[PDB]
Design a protein around this ligand. Structure first.
Ligand code: M57
Length: 268
């Protein structure tokens, strides 16, 4: 990663937290193209020991440029804290957007977002790179739909974060049902098939107005939910329900490739 100086970063408002990270909007002073000076909005992700895992994952994905993958500017390793400096996306995380706009999101919008997300996962699948934390909070909305201009919404997938292969078991349990059954029994089972399961969970989120599946269940009950091989309920808008269940297959080898997923998406 390109190294950025603490002196060139200004921290502004907190935008929340993630798994062992705090999120801030900020401004980076930089020399850009043609030597012009810029003050650029940036997203700063701050590691509050786990630093190696967070930066390795973001790094390996930033080796692959793609229109549906988030852009990382570099890191700030100055001082005491370790900071990832990332493009600032105008409309934030999808999960809060879905909740703040539930009454105005229709199947055409959902299918366009599902197709884009699958296009990103297909690209990762072809490059044999595992994301490991596909969820609606990690979908960034770049631009909203404009039914005037007929322009569709546009999303990007955010960086993987700390790998489930190093997170404490009780955080992994709280991430059920995004983390697949085989990773709960062993996080070292992390595989390309892992992302197919979480992709199904994310389609469920996309269809449920920002509800978190199984949120009423405490950690012990989430474990028992996998133990009994339950599936998620079909959302009220059930147009994607079959795809969701096809993706959340308890047999990882039976989960369909993202090519087949895309073909299935196109058939609607
Ligand atoms: N690049 C970027 N740009 C913006 N912009 C923005 C715009 C508006 C708003 S607001 N307040 O008006 O709604 C908020 C933000 N946000 N952003 C981003 O990466 N956010 C983000 C942070 C953390 C996570 C995440 N961490 C985990 C984990 O578990 O570790 C799981 O997900 C996911 C996404």
């Amino acid at each position: 990663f390109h190294k950025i100086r603490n002196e060139d970063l200004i921290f502004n408002e907190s935008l929340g937290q993630g798994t062992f990270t705090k999120i801030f909007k900020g401004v980076r002073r930089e020399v850009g193209d043609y030597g012009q000076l810029h003050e650029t909005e940036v997203l700063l992700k701050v590691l509050d020991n786990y630093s190696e895992s967070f930066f390795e994952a973001a790094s390996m994905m930033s080796k692959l440029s793609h229109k549906h993958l988030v852009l990382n500017y570099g890191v700030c390793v100055c001082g005491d804290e370790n900071i990832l400096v990332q493009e600032f996306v105008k409309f934030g995380s999808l999960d809060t957007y879905l909740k703040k706009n539930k009454n105005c999101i229709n199947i055409l919008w959902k299918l366009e977002v599902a197709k884009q997300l699958a296009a990103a996962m297909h690209f990762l699948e072809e490059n044999t790179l595992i994301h490991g934390n596909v969820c609606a909070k990690n979908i960034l909305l770049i631009r909203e739909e404009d039914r005037k201009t007929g322009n569709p919404p546009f999303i990007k997938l955010s960086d993987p974060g700390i790998s489930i292969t190093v997170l404490p078991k009780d955080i992994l349990q709280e991430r059920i049902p995004w983390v697949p059954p085989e990773c709960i029994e062993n996080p070292k089972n992390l595989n390309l098939a892992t992302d197919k399961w979480s992709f199904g969970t994310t389609l469920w989120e996309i269809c449920s107005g920002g509800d978190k599946p199984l949120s009423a269940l405490d950690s012990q009950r989430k474990l028992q939910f996998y133990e009994d091989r339950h599936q998620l309920p079909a959302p009220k808008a059930a147009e994607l329900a079959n795809l969701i269940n096809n993706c959340m297959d308890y047999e990882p080898d039976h989960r369909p490739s993202f090519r087949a997923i895309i073909r299935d998406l196109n058939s609607l």
